[PDB]
Amino acid sequence: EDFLGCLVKEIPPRLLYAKSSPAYPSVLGQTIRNSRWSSPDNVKPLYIITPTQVSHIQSAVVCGRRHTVRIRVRSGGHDYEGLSYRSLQPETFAVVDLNKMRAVWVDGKARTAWVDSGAQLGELYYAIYKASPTLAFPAGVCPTVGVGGNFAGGGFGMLLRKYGIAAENVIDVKLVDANGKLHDKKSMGDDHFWAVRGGGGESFGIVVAWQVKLLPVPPTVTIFKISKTVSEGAVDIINKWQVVAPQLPADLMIRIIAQGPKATFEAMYLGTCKTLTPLMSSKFPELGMNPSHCNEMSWIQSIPFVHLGHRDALEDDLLNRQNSFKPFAEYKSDYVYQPFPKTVWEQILNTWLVKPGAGIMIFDPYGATISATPESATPFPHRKGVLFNIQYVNYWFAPGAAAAPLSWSKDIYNYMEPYVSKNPRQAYANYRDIDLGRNEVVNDVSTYASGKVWGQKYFKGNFERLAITKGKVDPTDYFRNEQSIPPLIK
Ligand SMILES: *Cc1cc2c(nc3c(=O)[nH]c(=O)nc-3n2C[C@H](O)[C@H](O)[C@H](O)COP(=O)(O)OP(=O)(O)OC[C@H]2O[C@@H](n3cnc4c(N)ncnc43)[C@H](O)[C@@H]2O)c(*)c1C
Numbered sequence: 377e378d379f380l381g382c383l384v385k386e387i388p389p390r391l392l393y394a395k396s397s398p399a400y401p402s403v404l405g406q407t408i409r410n411s412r413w414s415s416p417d418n419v420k421p422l423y424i425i426t427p428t429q430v431s432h433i434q435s436a437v438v439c440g441r442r443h444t445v446r447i448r449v450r451s452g453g454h455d456y457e458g459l460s461y462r463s464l465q466p467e468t469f470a471v472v473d474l475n476k477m478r479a480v481w482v483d484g485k486a487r488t489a490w491v492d493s494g495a496q497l498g499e500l501y502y503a504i505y506k507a508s509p510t511l512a513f514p515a516g517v518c519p520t521v522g523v524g525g526n527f528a529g530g531g532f533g534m535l536l537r538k539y540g541i542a543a544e545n546v547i548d549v550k551l552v553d554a555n556g557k558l559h560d561k562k563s564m565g566d567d568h569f570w571a572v573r574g575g576g577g578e579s580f581g582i583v584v585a586w587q588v589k590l591l592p593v594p595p596t597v598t599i600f601k602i603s604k605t606v607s608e609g610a611v612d613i614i615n616k617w618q619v620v621a622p623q624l625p626a627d628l629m630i631r632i633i634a635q636g637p638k639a640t641f642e643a644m645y646l647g648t649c650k651t652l653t654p655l656m657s658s659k660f661p662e663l664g665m666n667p668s669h670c671n672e673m674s675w676i677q678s679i680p681f682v683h684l685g686h687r688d689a690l691e692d693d694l695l696n697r698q699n700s701f702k703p704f705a706e707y708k709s710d711y712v713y714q715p716f717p718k719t720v721w722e723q724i725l726n727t728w729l730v731k732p733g734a735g736i737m738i739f740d741p742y743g744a745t746i747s748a749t750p751e752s753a754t755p756f757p758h759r760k761g762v763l764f765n766i767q768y769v770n771y772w773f774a775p776g777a778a779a780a781p782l783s784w785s786k787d788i789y790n791y792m793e794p795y796v797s798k799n800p801r802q803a804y805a806n807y808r809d810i811d812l813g814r815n816e817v818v819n820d821v822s823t824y825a826s827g828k829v830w831g832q833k834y835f836k837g838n839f840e841r842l843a844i845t846k847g848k849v850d851p852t853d854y855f856r857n858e859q860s861i862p863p864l865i866k
Pocket residue numbers: 409448449450451452453454455456458459460474493515516517518520521522523524525526528529530531532533576577578579581582583584806807857
């Protein structure tokens with residue numbers, strides 16, 4: 377009652393939604409990307425606030441502190457467990473939803489931009505393009521992902537070998553802390569500014585906007601997508617790829633998608649067919665690439681082409697707030713430091729990817745720039761020595777069809793354990809997986825011991841510094857969820 381009362385004093389009421397409000401279901405559902413989490417059995421927010429100004433965010437936080445109602449912040453809503461808009465167990469929370477704060481201001485000459493957290497990646501990329509055809513930013517591949525969560529958790533895509541992760545190309549932020557105070561880099565200090573750029577969403581406050589450096593790309597890039605069935609020698613080719621791809625020049629990224637006994641090699645090359653063809657011949661002739669495979673286009677055109685296979689619909693693919701694709705979905709991830717034996721590739725392609733409920737596996741090679749940053753330089757620790765990341769993706773489309781996919785996801789994670797990283801078994805924070813572990817709350821504070829179980833998997837040796845920073849900026853654990861950094865205080 378009095379939390380809502382506090383909000384109405386400071387924030388335009390058209391931006392406030394209670395469960396009884398007629399628009400509440402629409403506002404709640406607008407950026408839910410996973411049908412597992414939209415159904416009525418999920419725990420719902422007591423209130424939703426859709427700020428349009430930074431002062432609205434500050435007022436919401438001050439009200440939540442005064443009346444002890446916690447806030448989950450949502451930008452693009454892609455959280456794999458939905459923790460930006462649901463809780464796992466019954467509890468009271470408000471959602472602060474940033475979708476209306478979506479400005480992108482590009483300074484093409486300075487090669488910098490200010491980007492609101494509620495902007496989607498496609499909108500960031502398109503705004504950069506409206507300014508220059510030869511500037512880029514290295515974040516995710518999916519245009520509807522929100523800037524807020526993508527940058528907070530790291531963020532990587534087809535430029536990761538050239539330029540590393542999104543978070544290490546951030547040069548300032550505008551942030552509201554757990555006391556409602558407005559911060560930038562200078563007022564936050566080294567620890568807090570280090571933590572917020574890759575240490576995971578929610579934990580370190582609400583980032584309102586990010587200042588980024590914009591990076592050069594040539595006017596023409598080249599994409600290919602070359603598939604090999606097991607009959608065409610997929611196992612021998614991918615067994616070579618895992619050693620070669622992490623060692624290729626920074627200008628060339630070759631990722632793999634597999635969903636059966638067949639591997640599709642997708643390359644982004646910062647250059648032309650003319651130079652790519654000989655490079656492939658010299659370094660990876662086993663793939664059988666030739667000039668007919670090349671698709672030359674601008675960097676901006678490469679974003680819908682890689683993600684959707686589209687060449688012809690730039691605005692529609694990058695400026696898209698319809699929220700049409702809502703699979704039921706499960707996700708896991710791994711990091712690989714040692715080459716798989718050929719027999720493991722045999723098993724993955726011929727056996728694991730031909731089971732009931734089998735999903736899709738995506739393999740991103742590291743090396744080059746992402747691996748040159750020291751492990752502790754940012755909170756993202758998956759750097760030197762990483763050959764490739766694996767994402768295990770399961771989609772299904774009817775409510776009662778979950779059992780086989782969920783079982784496959786668990787079974788293949790168990791199968792892969794001996795061949796992937798261990799002690800800890802590393803995972804990417806933005807591929808959130810609650811089965812890696814969740815927090816325990818004691819005296820209303822997330823415990824350090826419970827955070828450490830999953831926290832070492834996402835952040836390896838950076839977890840303790842994250843928790844000590846959390847203790848300094850949010851000792852009462854105001855901004856939290858079931859898998860957020862717990863405070864470690866003296
Ligand atoms: C759905 C989806 C996700 C993808 C896709 N492809 C990716 C890619 O190519 N590269 C990646 O690095 N990641 C990819 N992912 C995963 C996404 O990066 C993550 O799912 C992001 O965390 C999603 O961010 P966003 O869309 O903003 O999701 P939310 O659910 O709103 O938030 C996630 C998380 O972060 C907190 N949070 C949100 N907003 C803020 C701000 N402004 N400040 C601090 N913290 C924030 C939330 O509370 C929540 O905890 C491809 C697809 C299709």
